[PDB]
Amino acid sequence: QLTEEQIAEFKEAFSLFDKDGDGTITTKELGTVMRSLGQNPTEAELQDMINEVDADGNGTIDFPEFLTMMARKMKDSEEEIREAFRVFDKDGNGYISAAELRHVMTNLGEKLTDEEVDEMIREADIDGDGQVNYEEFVQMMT
Ligand SMILES: [Ca+2]
Ligand SMILES: [Ca+2]
Ligand SMILES: [Ca+2]
Ligand SMILES: [Ca+2]
Numbered sequence: 001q002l003t004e005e006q007i008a009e010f011k012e013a014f015s016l017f018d019k020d021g022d023g024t025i026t027t028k029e030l031g032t033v034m035r036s037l038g039q040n041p042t043e044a045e046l047q048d049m050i051n052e053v054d055a056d057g058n059g060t061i062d063f064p065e066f067l068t069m070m071a072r073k074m075k076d077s078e079e080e081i082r083e084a085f086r087v088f089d090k091d092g093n094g095y096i097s098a099a100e101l102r103h104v105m106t107n108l109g110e111k112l113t114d115e116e117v118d119e120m121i122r123e124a125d126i127d128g129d130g131q132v133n134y135e136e137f138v139q140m141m142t
Contacts, residue, residue: 002071014066016108024060025050036107037087074142085137095131096121 002010017025017033027046034041041049053061053069074081088096088104102117112120124132124140132140 002067007067010067010070011063012110013070014063016110017061017066019109024062025066026060030061033108036109037104039083039087081138081141082134084141085134088132088137095129095133096137097131101132 014025015021017029019029019032027043027050030049031041031043031046034046050059050061053065055065055068056062085096086092088100090100090103098114098117098121101120102112102114105112105117121130121132124136126136126139127133
């Protein structure tokens with residue numbers, strides 16, 4: 001179950017998508033995010049992505065709809081997770097480093113302290129090596 005701190009973190013993630021701060025994520029904003037993460041969805045693809053999440057059918061994603069998606073996470077999806085992993089593991093060595101995570105967050109327009117980046121890595125790190133491997137990443141997502 002979600003906690004206060006975790007809901008507040010998902011709200012911060014939502015604000016990285018909601019570029020114009022109007023409280024909804026549009027296809028355009030989703031496209032911007034996806035491209036900043038190295039993906040190249042078409043217009044129709046973006047519409048399909050929003051449609052999966054858009055509970056009230058208004059064509060945009062509000063925070064309760066975003067949180068509804070995040071709450072459930074993934075369940076028993078393989079290939080999308082490897083693609084997401086590769087977004088972060090830009091050198092391809094199989095480990096997400098704090099520098100790699102910070103670079104991603106900077107491309108999304110989030111400026112974080114070193115403490116904050118380390119805290120993020122710590123939350124997903126299981127073995128304590130200070131990096132996130134794929135098995136760790138899968139467990140975070142599911
Ligand atoms: Ca917006
Ligand atoms: Ca909506
Ligand atoms: Ca790496
Ligand atoms: Ca690790």
